[PDB]
Amino acid sequence: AQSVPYGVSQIKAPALHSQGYTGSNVKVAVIDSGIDSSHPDLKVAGGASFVPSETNPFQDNNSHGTHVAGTVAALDNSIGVLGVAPSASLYAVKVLGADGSGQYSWIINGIEWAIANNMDVINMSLGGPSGSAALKAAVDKAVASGVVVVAAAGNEGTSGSSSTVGYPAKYPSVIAVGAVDSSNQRASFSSVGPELDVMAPGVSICSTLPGNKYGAKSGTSMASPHVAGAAALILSKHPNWTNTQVRSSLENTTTKLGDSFYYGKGLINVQAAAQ
Template identity: 45%
Template structure:
């Protein structure tokens, strides 16, 4: 009997304690608006950063001084105060968000199509006497991606960096395969369009396929400091970033020709081109198949500049192997490689001139909303570049239609 009384006493006690806890409305350690998060701030020349950080108790994690952009760890309360008190010294404040390679790749082709399409890369574009002379030699191309497998026997990687590794930033090995595939389209000895171009790995995208805006900006900053001629960015996001746009604008001003895929969002009644391709100073590339038809997955919008092969593409893969892949990520490096050929033929050509050459030598195929200015024609573009070299001409300004 005493045993049952004891059990009843224990149960009653627990019940009373539970009621007390519920009524007392305890405060649990939940996230609040004052918990610090990573932000990007753009600052003007008028800002004295040392005094600014001291007065506002702000920790600058990274400072991209060439770009006037800093990555900071601040609370939402601090964000409000900065917007109120420093509006004359700060150009923007935004959360450090993410872009991804997933929006522009990883669409596997069918085996039946593989057998037919495998010759599309090298044979179509390199079986021409022009490419025995102009192979991208002396042109530096940054591949901002998941890194590159620099052990691949068909690739000659000159160097690189790894913004994803914030401690050292030296291990730019690719463990995913995306960056290696892109690099192969550009400059592999067997299948590349510009086999003698100097390729550099910029590992701004993690092994999961995502990259923070700060990592991408850090990669762009590296490209500027190391004097890249061309930057291929096979990444995409639907979110706008002022910091990313300003970094790209700076790179463009420094003479870097920037190429990016339009994304794999398929057809829509309204534009679904992703950033960074949507930016004014990025050459936006969509995907077509072997027949020149827009790939079903390729995004649409008036921001598209040109189309290039992006379906059932054969290129380098991990572990010294090769593979087939589809996606607008595969189309973008065709244009980057073509730009390298033009640069090797005409080293003094400007970004605006390259854009004009591509646009005016594209093969018109369909309406602009789906095909941009047409399909990339490397041979015609290269010949046009040589003509411009021999007889300089005043080029018209090509105005890209874009919305931010």
């Protein structure tokens, strides 16, 4: 039978699905460790690999990318889980290796690929402590080209009074996503700062794993695809909305939680955001 992960329900995605809004024709790039295209609960439309030693974007030797992708778009059928936007056209942009790391050049190459390939939504469940002029340029260009760019805020917790949001999430053009649990409490690991935008479920998230498996993972990497998936639902209902509109809508209709330094604008509500 199919199971609906708590997180999907929490952001109110099923309300949209019931209406017939499921992300059809929206192109979402998962920039990560690849996607196992052999998984019966996923449908990969395309993609590219920028990892010099791992040239097939459709082999995920890590598991991270497959898991993120399932959150965005696990198919609505009689098996496994259900994604936020089950009808989305999913692209595997492999910029991380088997070990879950990757060079900035690889990551940037992936963003440039996504712009050139007309992705509607980019999901970056990754980050580093330092930025670069090239990293900023690429995210800025994507936004200027009308792409919705979403990224995990980071898993650095709190540190005195400073921001622990990593890059590229830290850049204003990118939506920075922090993690909450099923009770709406901020996860202890969730990065904090004035650059945090919104929260989404990120603790014990059940999704797809390579080799026709399913398992839970925790992290802001798990939170981000709920927002990428949400953007895809909005776009399926309002195809003419610009990325700016999508973003404002998501931020403006959240369920307010605690202070913005810890929760940003609050928990997204795709139902409210979709008007």
